Amino acid sequence: TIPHLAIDPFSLDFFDDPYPDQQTLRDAGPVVYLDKWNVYGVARYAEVHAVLNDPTTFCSSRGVGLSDFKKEKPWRPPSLILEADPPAHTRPRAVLSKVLSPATMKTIRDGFAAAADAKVDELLQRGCIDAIADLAEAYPLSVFPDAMGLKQEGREHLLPYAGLVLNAFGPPNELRQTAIERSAPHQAYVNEQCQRPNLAPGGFGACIHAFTDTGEITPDEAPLLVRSLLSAGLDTTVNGIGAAVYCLARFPGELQRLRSDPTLARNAFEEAVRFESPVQTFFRTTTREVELGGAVIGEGEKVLMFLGSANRDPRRWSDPDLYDITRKTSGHVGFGSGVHMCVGQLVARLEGEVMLSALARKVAAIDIDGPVKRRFNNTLRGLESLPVKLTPA
Ligand code: HEM
Ligand SMILES: O=C(O)c1ccc(C(=O)O)cc1
Ligand SMILES: [Cl-]
């Protein structure tokens, strides 16, 4: 019925070049079984989209990683939104959607845009820079911790903590275990900044605590919802912006089109999110014996969704290996789909738009002038270092 495959989607050889193995996963069938970790896998757009939009059958409360929370204890207290199902997910999701609302983006857009223009001006004075550390990392670190309301001290724990959370979604390989074996300092800092006295007024974290009045969340729920923003609102955006600059460096014809019409900046970032898919994979757990694409999946089984493979499926996308800033990206699952679709997608799109807008208006060429190093993560796909030479427009 179901083809069995020995491909390890969490090995270094897979992270280094996943596209050939992702076609093998798609072409093998709509549902595969991965003997390496005893999990079901779906790599086509159709099945990935169906699993995401059936939260009842493919639950999230038993973990969005490999580990089954009904069988093992989670390395940290479960997230009140990511690792919950309706109706327990509904009200905490509604609060976060109002904290990161369209009305919230209006209060932060000008400061986010100004900091984006100032960063590109600073990098043009240096010429040859690292598009990861000096751009993909430096810019979100310059706007997001302030928008969260975090103090200055201890911000060096934010990125290590985020990479740990995303590595912990994977199997118990060395990547996950070495991350957990280094987690105590990063866990202590993040848990402390989630408390109301440590969140500056007006920030995202303080806004969450102010939503305990309405009966949607209780005061004891607010710290964990702040923890979700510190776990998902930084490193995701870093690799998304790093992906956008990477594509603009690998597709100069698309950079020139972006320069001619900087209003394409928002879609240029969205296409980058589809092209690279910073969030490559995560899991669901069947609550019931379900038939998916002609295959019977039993109860309590982990289902691995390949978001990046779904975003490159030729059954859904015309020329999926092509970076096209004018492509109608509507329907891609880079931000997920359904009740769990990324609640911070407006913040990420704002950061990506104003950074690509600043590059469109100020930069004439982006040329790689050094060794490209890939950052390895069980869930995240991104670059460790991207040496580029920026030519002023
Ligand atoms: C390029 C940037 C980003 C990408 C690619 C991304 C990707 C995703 C994806 C695919 C999901 C679905 C998870 C699932 O279905 O299990 C998700 C959920 C989530 N994201 Fe993002 N995200 C990004 C930025 C952000 C930002 C900026 C924030 C907060 C400021 C954030 C916070 C969250 C939260 C809290 C959830 C859980 C929502 C829920 O379970 O209902 N993410 N993200
Ligand atoms: O990057 C992600 O997919 C993600 C990680 C953590 C959380 C959370 O802490 O609720 C939500 C989303
Ligand atoms: Cl924690």
Establish whether residue 165 lines the binding site of ligand 2, counting it when its CB lies within 6 angstroms of any ligand atom. Answer: yes
How far away, in angstroms, is 279 Cα from ligand 3 center?
20
Q: What tokens appear for 61 in the block?
A: 């409360």
Say if ligand 1 is within 6 A of residue 148 CB.
no
**Sign of dihedral through CA atoms 383, 276, 239, 230?**
negative
342 marked as part of a ligand binding site: yes
Can you point out the beta strands (E) in 289-328? 290-292, 295-297, 302-306
Q: Is 284 annotated as a binding residue?
A: yes
Angle at the Cα of 350 from the Cα atoms of 211 and 321, rounded to 5 degrees:
125
Helix (H) or strand (E) holding 28: helix 19-28
**Three-state SS at 94:** helix
Residue with CA at minimum distance from ligand 2 atom 5: 232
Distant-in-sequence, close-in-space partners of 91: CB < 8 Å, separation ≥ 6: 216, 217
Hey, is 255 helix, strand or coil? helix
Rounded to whole angstroms, the Cα distance separating 229 from 390 reads 32
Atom of ligand 1 nearest to the CA of 84: 40
Measuring CA to CA, which residue among 176, 137, 135, 234 is closest to residue 377? 176
ω into 252 cis (within 30 of 0): no
Q: What span, in angstroms and rounded, lies between the C-alpha atoms of 35 and 4?
A: 6
Task: Return the amino acid letter for 284.
Answer: R
Closest CA to 160 of 131, 196, 186, 128: 186
Find the ligand nearest to 77 CA.
3
Please state, in angstroms and rounded to a whole number, the distance separating the CA atoms of residues 50 and 54.
Answer: 6
Which string of DSSP letters, residue by residue, matches 241-260? HHHHHHHHHH-HHHHHHHHH
Phi/psi for 197 (5° steps) reads -65, -20
Other Cβ atoms less than 10 A from the Cβ of 23: the count is 15
The four Cα atoms 221, 225, 162, 268 give a dihedral, to 10 degrees, of: 170
Angstrom distance (rounded) from CA 244 to CA 315: 24
In angstroms, the CA 244 to CA 256 distance is 14
What is the distance in A from the centroid of ligand 2 to the CA of 244? 21
Q: Is 89 known to sit in a ligand binding site?
A: yes
Which technique?
A: X-ray
Q: What number of other Cβ atoms are within 10 A of residue 138's Cβ?
A: 18
Please name which of 378, 391, 313, 386 lies closest in space to residue 180, comparing C-alpha atoms: 378
Q: What is the CA radius of gyration of the chain?
A: 20
> The tokens 């990392």 sit on which residue?
137
Q: Are 270 and 329 in contact (CB under 8 A)?
A: yes
363 CB-side CA count, 13 A: 35
Instruction: Output the CA–CA distances (angstroms, integers) from residue 163 to 61, 128, 188, 331, in the order listed.
Output: 21, 27, 15, 27
Phi, psi torsion values for 33, nearest 5 degrees: -120, 130
Alpha carbons 269 and 356: distance in angstroms, whole number: 7
Q: Are strands 39-42 and 32-34 parallel, antiparallel or unpaired?
A: antiparallel
302-306 vs 39-42, strand pairing mode: parallel
d(CA 112, CA 121): 14
Count CA atoms closer than 13 A to 217's CA, side-chain side: 27
Burial of 231 (0-12, 13-18, 19+ CB in 10 A): buried
Which ligand 1 atom is the nearest neighbour of the CA of 277? 5
d(CA 29, CA 44): 9
The neighbouring-strand residues paired with 389 are 128, 367
How far apart (Å, rounded) are the C-alpha atoms in residues 341 and 97? 11
Nearest to 283 by CA among 38, 11, 62: 62
Across 103-142, the runs of DSSP E, i.e. the strands, are 128-130
Query: Which residue ranges make up each domain of the chain?
Result: 1-393
CA pseudo-torsion sign 210, 215, 220, 222:
negative
Pairing between strand 128-130 and 39-42?
unpaired
Do 203 and 148 touch, CB atoms closer than 8 A? Answer: yes
Q: Work out the angle at residue 14's Cα, subtended by the Cα atoms of residues 10 and 16, and round it to the nearest 5 degrees.
A: 120
Which amino acid, one-letter code, is at 143?
V
381 assigned ligand-binding residue = no
Q: Whose CA is nearest to atom 23 of ligand 1?
A: 236
The finding on whether 340 has its CB within 6 A of some atom of ligand 1 is: yes
What's the chain's length in residues? Answer: 393
Half-sphere exposure of residue 327: CA atoms within 13 angstroms, side-chain side? 24
Residue linked to tokens 């928002």 = 266
Query: With 0-12 CB in 10 A as exposed, 13-18 as middle and 19+ as buried, what is 390?
Result: buried
For residue 142, give the amino acid letter.
S
Residue 281 CB–ligand 2 contact under 6 Å: no
Q: Token pair of 29, please?
A: 């069938």
- The atom of ligand 1 lying closest to the CA of 239 is 1
